């Protein structure tokens, strides 16, 4: 699954959670993929999406609220966006995503 | 005392089967216990067959019958239809004829 690979990336690669840091990660060209929660307000989605393409970073719209994405990254708090800084032995960077 | 190893009809390993409504009196009766007969009989009868292909287009053309099942409610199945009674050891025999 898409969770299945996120769960790998969590356990073998590098990442960062939250909005301020993915932008620090977008500005430094570090993010290879950002994952946006369904209920994240559009304006933030827009701004991330804009910051994305300026970085030529790909964007996956996680079909799901922030409460769920926090679960998917294996965290007990809610997360609105994620930034894959290095994918581990997972292939999200180079699969149908 | 008991007077049938089947207690009635055809149910071992199940526990409950849906009932059917008798075709004569409409009494409910479990389908496993409900004396059944397929009704196959022509539309035309012993005499109307000759009168049929006489004043008819399409030489004899099909003679198609009507087919339906019947469900009896032992009370009814005994009143008219196929049991009437069997003796003690006549009871056992399940040969149709």
């Amino acid at each position: 699954s898409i969770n299945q690979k996120l769960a790998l990336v969590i356990k073998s690669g590098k990442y960062t959670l939250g909005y301020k840091s993915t932008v620090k990660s977008l500005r430094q060209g570090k993010s290879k993929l950002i994952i946006i929660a369904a209920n994240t307000p559009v304006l933030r989605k827009s701004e991330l999406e804009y910051y994305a393409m300026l970085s030529k970073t790909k964007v996956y719209y996680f079909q799901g609220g922030n409460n769920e994405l926090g679960t998917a990254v294996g965290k007990l708090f809610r997360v609105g966006v994620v930034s894959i800084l290095e994918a581990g032995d997972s292939d999200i960077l180079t699969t149908l995503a | 005392p008991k007077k049938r190893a089947s207690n009635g009809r055809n149910k071992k390993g199940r526990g409950h089967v849906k009932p059917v409504r008798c075709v004569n009196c409409s009494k409910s009766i479990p389908k496993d216990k409900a004396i059944k007969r397929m009704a196959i009989r022509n539309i035309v009868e012993a005499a109307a067959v000759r009168d049929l292909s006489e004043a008819s287009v399409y030489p004899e053309y099909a003679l198609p019958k009507t087919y339906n099942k019947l469900h009896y409610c032992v009370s009814c199945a005994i009143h008219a239809r196929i049991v009437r009674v069997r003796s003690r050891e006549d009871r056992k025999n399940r040969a149709p004829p």
Binding site: - | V23, S26, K27, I43, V44, D51, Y58, Y61, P64, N68
Partner: protein, 127 residues
């Protein structure tokens, strides 16, 4: 060769219904039924009754123009006996025997994917 029509015999018990309509249905002709040719209220379906009403039936059937007709025999159906009444086998006979023609008849007894609990309670009509 001839001029077609639909018969659609509904021969339940306690009455029998023979009436011809256009091969399309929306236009009907010549209905008179089995409770119309006797007055006994227990002979309202007997073959001897549906016969006499088959005679009046084919009469207008030719007095209007149908020389041939297909039949669609039918019982009560629905949640009922599903089985043909007695005055159907008389009627089909006494309408082909009236010099009418017969082609490709079938059965149109309504038969459901069982539902709509029958009348008369789980213990049956006990008499």
């Amino acid at each position: 060769s001839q001029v077609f029509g639909v018969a659609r015999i509904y021969a339940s018990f306690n009455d029998t219904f023979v009436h011809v309509t256009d091969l399309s249905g929306k236009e009907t002709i010549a209905r008179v039924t089995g409770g119309m040719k006797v007055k006994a209220d227990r002979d309202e379906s007997s073959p001897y009754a549906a016969m006499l009403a088959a005679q009046d039936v084919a009469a207008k059937c030719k007095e209007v123009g149908i020389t041939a007709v297909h039949v669609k025999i039918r019982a009560t159906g629905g949640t009922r006996t599903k089985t043909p009444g007695p005055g159907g086998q008389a009627a089909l006979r006494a309408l082909a025997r009236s010099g009418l023609r017969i082609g490709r008849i079938e059965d149109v007894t309504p038969v459901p994917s069982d539902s709509t609990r029958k009348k008369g309670g789980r213990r049956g009509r006990r008499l």
